[PDB]
Design a protein around this motif. Structure first.
Motif, PDB file in Angstrom:
ATOM      1  N   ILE C  17       1.217  -1.609  -0.086  1.00  0.00           N
ATOM      2  CA  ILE C  17       0.488   0.228  -0.005  1.00  0.00           C
ATOM      3  C   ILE C  17       0.998   1.224  -0.197  1.00  0.00           C
ATOM      4  O   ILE C  17       0.734   2.208  -0.471  1.00  0.00           O
ATOM      5  CB  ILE C  17      -1.257  -0.194   1.108  1.00  0.00           C
ATOM      6  CG1 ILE C  17      -1.657   1.584   0.954  1.00  0.00           C
ATOM      7  CG2 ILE C  17      -0.243  -0.451   2.356  1.00  0.00           C
ATOM      8  CD1 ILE C  17      -2.766   1.320  -0.276  1.00  0.00           C
ATOM      9  N   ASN C  18       1.987   0.977   0.159  1.00  0.00           N
ATOM     10  CA  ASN C  18       2.962   2.013   0.580  1.00  0.00           C
ATOM     11  C   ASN C  18       3.606   2.410  -0.846  1.00  0.00           C
ATOM     12  O   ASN C  18       4.060   3.398  -1.137  1.00  0.00           O
ATOM     13  CB  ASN C  18       4.143   1.799   1.168  1.00  0.00           C
ATOM     14  CG  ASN C  18       4.623   2.107   2.742  1.00  0.00           C
ATOM     15  OD1 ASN C  18       3.105   2.258   3.548  1.00  0.00           O
ATOM     16  ND2 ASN C  18       5.176   2.389   3.440  1.00  0.00           N
ATOM     17  N   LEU C  19       3.144   1.215  -1.466  1.00  0.00           N
ATOM     18  CA  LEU C  19       3.861   1.583  -3.449  1.00  0.00           C
ATOM     19  C   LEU C  19       2.459   2.104  -3.876  1.00  0.00           C
ATOM     20  O   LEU C  19       2.767   3.030  -5.294  1.00  0.00           O
ATOM     21  CB  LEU C  19       4.154   0.278  -3.493  1.00  0.00           C
ATOM     22  CG  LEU C  19       3.879  -0.080  -5.295  1.00  0.00           C
ATOM     23  CD1 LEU C  19       5.720   0.709  -5.815  1.00  0.00           C
ATOM     24  CD2 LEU C  19       4.218  -1.353  -5.791  1.00  0.00           C
ATOM     25  N   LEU C  20       1.345   2.078  -3.248  1.00  0.00           N
ATOM     26  CA  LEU C  20      -0.087   2.234  -4.442  1.00  0.00           C
ATOM     27  C   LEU C  20      -0.016   3.748  -4.008  1.00  0.00           C
ATOM     28  O   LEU C  20      -0.581   4.336  -5.467  1.00  0.00           O
ATOM     29  CB  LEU C  20      -0.559   1.509  -3.689  1.00  0.00           C
ATOM     30  CG  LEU C  20      -1.956   2.268  -4.146  1.00  0.00           C
ATOM     31  CD1 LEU C  20      -2.462   2.398  -6.134  1.00  0.00           C
ATOM     32  CD2 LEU C  20      -3.348   1.413  -4.008  1.00  0.00           C
ATOM     33  N   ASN C  21       0.656   3.979  -3.154  1.00  0.00           N
ATOM     34  CA  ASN C  21       0.251   5.378  -2.549  1.00  0.00           C
ATOM     35  C   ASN C  21       1.244   6.629  -3.010  1.00  0.00           C
ATOM     36  O   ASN C  21       1.639   7.519  -4.182  1.00  0.00           O
ATOM     37  CB  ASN C  21       0.409   5.216  -1.547  1.00  0.00           C
ATOM     38  CG  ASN C  21      -1.144   5.363  -0.637  1.00  0.00           C
ATOM     39  OD1 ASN C  21      -1.725   5.665  -0.958  1.00  0.00           O
ATOM     40  ND2 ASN C  21      -0.190   4.558   1.144  1.00  0.00           N
ATOM     41  N   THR C  22       2.651   5.114  -3.446  1.00  0.00           N
ATOM     42  CA  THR C  22       4.164   6.096  -3.553  1.00  0.00           C
ATOM     43  C   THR C  22       3.764   6.371  -5.244  1.00  0.00           C
ATOM     44  O   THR C  22       4.507   7.646  -5.558  1.00  0.00           O
ATOM     45  CB  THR C  22       5.355   5.091  -3.484  1.00  0.00           C
ATOM     46  OG1 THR C  22       5.651   4.912  -2.445  1.00  0.00           O
ATOM     47  CG2 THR C  22       6.775   5.659  -4.440  1.00  0.00           C
ATOM     48  N   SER C  23       2.807   5.716  -6.462  1.00  0.00           N
ATOM     49  CA  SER C  23       2.885   5.861  -7.893  1.00  0.00           C
ATOM     50  C   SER C  23       1.761   5.113  -8.495  1.00  0.00           C
ATOM     51  O   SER C  23       1.507   3.514  -7.134  1.00  0.00           O
ATOM     52  CB  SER C  23       3.980   5.787  -8.056  1.00  0.00           C
ATOM     53  OG  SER C  23       3.369   6.318  -9.749  1.00  0.00           O
ATOM     54  N   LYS C  24       0.593   5.581  -8.896  1.00  0.00           N
ATOM     55  CA  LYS C  24      -0.520   4.555  -9.121  1.00  0.00           C
ATOM     56  C   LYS C  24      -0.128   4.535 -10.250  1.00  0.00           C
ATOM     57  O   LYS C  24      -0.495   2.520 -10.371  1.00  0.00           O
ATOM     58  CB  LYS C  24      -1.756   5.025  -8.973  1.00  0.00           C
ATOM     59  CG  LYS C  24      -2.125   5.231  -7.741  1.00  0.00           C
ATOM     60  CD  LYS C  24      -3.919   6.580  -8.224  1.00  0.00           C
ATOM     61  CE  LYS C  24      -4.699   6.708  -6.651  1.00  0.00           C
ATOM     62  NZ  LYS C  24      -4.719   5.543  -5.369  1.00  0.00           N
ATOM     63  N   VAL C  25       1.188   4.573 -11.448  1.00  0.00           N
ATOM     64  CA  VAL C  25       1.220   3.710 -12.474  1.00  0.00           C
ATOM     65  C   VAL C  25       2.356   2.538 -12.395  1.00  0.00           C
ATOM     66  O   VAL C  25       1.524   1.558 -12.894  1.00  0.00           O
ATOM     67  CB  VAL C  25       2.120   4.826 -12.676  1.00  0.00           C
ATOM     68  CG1 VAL C  25       2.832   4.594 -15.161  1.00  0.00           C
ATOM     69  CG2 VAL C  25       1.234   6.010 -13.880  1.00  0.00           C
TER      70      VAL C  25
ATOM     71  N   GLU D 255      13.563   5.229  -9.835  1.00  0.00           N
ATOM     72  CA  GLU D 255      13.972   6.600  -9.464  1.00  0.00           C
ATOM     73  C   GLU D 255      13.017   7.540  -9.239  1.00  0.00           C
ATOM     74  O   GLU D 255      13.518   8.810 -10.010  1.00  0.00           O
ATOM     75  CB  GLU D 255      15.171   7.115  -8.426  1.00  0.00           C
ATOM     76  CG  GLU D 255      16.268   6.328  -9.613  1.00  0.00           C
ATOM     77  CD  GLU D 255      17.244   5.487  -8.506  1.00  0.00           C
ATOM     78  OE1 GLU D 255      17.103   4.847  -7.530  1.00  0.00           O
ATOM     79  OE2 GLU D 255      18.366   4.957  -9.623  1.00  0.00           O
ATOM     80  N   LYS D 256      11.550   7.526  -9.266  1.00  0.00           N
ATOM     81  CA  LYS D 256      10.481   8.642 -10.650  1.00  0.00           C
ATOM     82  C   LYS D 256      10.061   9.098  -8.918  1.00  0.00           C
ATOM     83  O   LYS D 256      10.613  10.699  -8.887  1.00  0.00           O
ATOM     84  CB  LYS D 256       9.762   7.909 -10.704  1.00  0.00           C
ATOM     85  CG  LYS D 256       8.430   8.581 -11.470  1.00  0.00           C
ATOM     86  CD  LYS D 256       9.526   9.501 -12.427  1.00  0.00           C
ATOM     87  CE  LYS D 256       8.349  10.411 -13.147  1.00  0.00           C
ATOM     88  NZ  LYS D 256       9.149  11.548 -13.807  1.00  0.00           N
TER      89      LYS D 256
END
Lengths: 256, 256, 257, 256, 256
Positions: C17-25, D255-256
């Motif tokens: 969920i940390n990654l989904l928040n980090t970015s959705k792409v 690293e985006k």
């Protein structure tokens, strides 16, 4: 490379006469675990041989041969004592003189009696399952039980020779690598080989003659035909393990 | 080598009740799982057997024991509580004075029930799929869940011994090697041997009878027969795992 | 080892969920790779299923199961987002106070929708191969797609558990060993079982109701019959993933502390 | 784990252009090695189709996929360079600016060409064996190289995509573990997947057509389809490595 | 990555000649081992192919190739001296100067003959069993000793080339990894490929022409057909190992 091995083989050879000279109850047990383990392998591939010999399939000896991996694999993993390996080992340790010709025939003896004790126990139990009461299962038992006791001497001798070859060459392979998986595969192979090809293994033959004599559904070999088949093959096993592999290993890795 | 094994074994037994004694929730769930995992193995092999029996294949019993490695492999990998395996663990443990003769039964009970709880919970859920709704799947579960209750007690006993010799040695094998692949392999063999050869497994049958009794489309045996079996076989499974497997590891590895 | 494992299961919920928040792409992509990876293995076992149904063979269902391993193996080895999987991880990671019912439901959606988009893309691409113009395989597809719609919601629901019980259990296994050889091997057995037995898998059925709707060489199912099958199965999947696998792992490994 | 993986790829590609920027002779005799290794698969799996199609066994297309595993295996275990691999490798890297569109293509055509020498070299040798003079092996080459050449661009192009999705992904898997065993196990399932399913591989076609051409006994292909097929497929495999597995892996850990 | 492997390949070829420039009895007993092992392989896959041809099962060729795995993996797992292996090794070292054109053609002979010795030994000991009394075993051992001997030189030249291409690349695989498991797996693949495709490995034929030349039941062509086959095939193995692989492995690792 061959030294570190003929090293390993020598130490292990010693660690065998040491446990013997400790408790005989111990050494006896471990020999009568290997016999029983190995016997398990006969039950599988004989419950097999029936089902496939019966239905005419030509795959029998192939499928059988493949499905006998469980034998020498239970042994090597459980670390138990079986004579066919005690050959090549107890030899190069007698050649590399960690143990003497004394300690060699000291071993090959008890292990062989131990190994038999195991077969006999699994017999009683296996026979007590009604599995070898009727059917093409005890039929495959009986016939090959008989097949092998009527076979001339030099065969059982020379077939026995090639058997303990692979068996040792596997056992050796165990010493030469540290991946248990790899041991199991090399074993899987070296037994697929000898079984399908059609060779003879004493500690094995035992579980065969262990079942076909407790049998309330046949004899076709008696005790005499059993003694013969063993002592024939036992004798064969030794030249294969000791004078080929036991010796050649001792050479290849002798600190010369 | 045998010594070490024994120790590890001894802890596992100590570490067994220890858990059971802190939680009975946590332990019930574990045997619950285990018994269900073992029963997932049954669904698979029986969905096979009906499909191959329908077509009269001479192989059927060879493909089945090949397709059973999933059951006990899932146990050992999820690290869960299997009644049969304990038979060796506690017996060798109790023996090695690390755990009691009352810590021993209190495990066997609590697991023989857990496994069955699982067997049940899995049995119900299978039915609710309806591959058992009819046809050779529903059938096979029957014609076989019948054959077991209508069999000598002298059979179900030695059948149920040789099975749980192969089951604990498979376990013993996991206690001796660090390869999780080799752990699985030996498990895959040992069930190839015990299932193909027609040996008997209490915790497995639990799922069999968990399903031949929840299936609206017929019984032929009913509780008593199911009880006549789990009982006649669980005892065997104890005599195999305890008197044979655990006593030997004990003998093979205690300081004289 | 059950505590350390929950820790892992838990810790794995978190950085998801940390990654989904980090970015959705970044997240949605992975989700699609998963769908695709799993669907890939559908294309294999049905081709097998066609090849061998066409010859009235008995060992069809059996080879089809022995073969599907690649589906969940690609998922695990590539490390990618597979719905059925998150069903166990995310739940037990919630229960173990890793993240919220919010993030749990938020993850279950995207994965399920990304899994879908892989199923989508793979299907069109596969119709484009022309390997379902006619023959015994486009047949097997439709023959099979229909059953999965033409089936009682009760049994689709239930079959769909055990399946996710088995998928998740293999995931569980991916967390208790350091042998990539062992990981795959257990995935093998678990899929051999789930498939050959008769159980249902939302993400893989997602790839079935994608081929047969995108191929002009037949709908025998159309969109509705899929919505049905998916739903019934997506539930069951959830009922085994979070409730038998998710719960159990927690109850086995949560420090009462 | 994604960013490590990406980076690994990125460096992998660097090394590639660097080697190419170092030795042309070193790079183009690695290339040929791959294509040759790969082509070996095509020999085996057509030798298989041969026997299998000749007896119309339904399992032809199944045993082929299971057996084509040696191809990428031999490549991946021997660090050799496979065009279809560098489609994901070169691109993931250039997307992270570890290289430039130019290196990519230099690679792509260099690797492609050495690869083409492999198939050319094998086929010749393979022709010389007698194994294509006649017998159902050659019918299988001819008939296949044929259809492969005489099939709508659209199709072939899409069969390209799917194939190289699996090829690279398997390679992706190689970059993501250390159990060399596993790298193989996966290579196995990915090729089982891609052959038995129908997808077209460029490098591997080379050998196919190469054998068919240089076979005196009938071609049905001519260099006419060769180019056609080798193009349509290659153009697919590029969208396979590059646009899916390639750009997809970049979007997964930058690293985006 | 190729430098380590040439460096790994050179140290090897120094030892192989530094074993002979230390002892003949050492070096040959290992080469008589390699040969026998490879032979044991042929004793199996011909045992099969005899059974499988006796029932027109189209699956003959394939099954045989899967089961041949044992020979080169035995040779590998036991470090022994196999000719074909050497081809690549030597020349890879004589090209990167660790041994001389002498040490090369020196290794190649003793082992070639060492290998032959062991092949003759197993042969008798195989008839010693009498499994070539009759049945299709000796039959298959007959047709295939002769079919191989009454075949054009050029074919068997081209055939044998392709073989030692694989046989060495599997050895080369040995060097490029620390998983015996993986090693054995690649041998399994590289062997299954060379046999089922059709190619010709000399040191194996040695056992075939050993088995048959002592098979009391017939010669079918003679010694001038065994020598011719061995000459035709051996030289083919050498271009394939020495020129293809050896030269190649060298070009790949060489330090400009």
């Amino acid at each position: 490379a061959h030294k570190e091995t003929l090293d390993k083989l020598t130490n292990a050879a010693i660690n065998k006469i040491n446990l013997l000279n400790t408790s005989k109850v111990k050494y006896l047990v471990s020999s009568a675990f290997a016999g029983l383990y190995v016997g398990i392998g006969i039950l599988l591939i004989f419950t097999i041989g029936g089902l496939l010999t019966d239905a005419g399939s030509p795959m029998t000896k192939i499928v059988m041969g493949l499905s006998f991996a469980i034998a020498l694999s239970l042994v090597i993993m459980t670390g138990t004592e079986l004579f066919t390996g005690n050959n090549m080992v107890m030899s190069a340790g007698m050649l590399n003189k960690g143990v003497s010709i004394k300690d060699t025939s000291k071993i090959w003896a008890y292990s062989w009696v131990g190994n038999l004790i195991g077969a006999l126990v699994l017999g009683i139990i296996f026979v007590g399952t009604g599995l070898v009461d009727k059917g093409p299962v005890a039929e495959f038992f009986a016939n090959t039980a008989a097949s092998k006791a009527s076979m001339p001497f030099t065969a059982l001798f020379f077939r026995g020779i090639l058997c303990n070859i692979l068996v040792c060459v596997s056992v050796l392979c165990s010493f030469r690598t540290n991946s248990d998986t790899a041991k199991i595969i090399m074993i899987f192979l070296c037994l697929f080989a000898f079984i399908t090809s059609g060779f003879e293994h004493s500690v094995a033959n035992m579980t065969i003659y262990s079942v076909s004599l407790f049998s309330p559904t046949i004899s076709t070999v008696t005790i005499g035909g059993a003694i013969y088949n063993l002592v024939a093959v036992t004798l064969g096993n030794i030249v294969g393990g000791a004078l080929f592999m036991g010796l050649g290993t001792y050479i290849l890795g002798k600190e010369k």
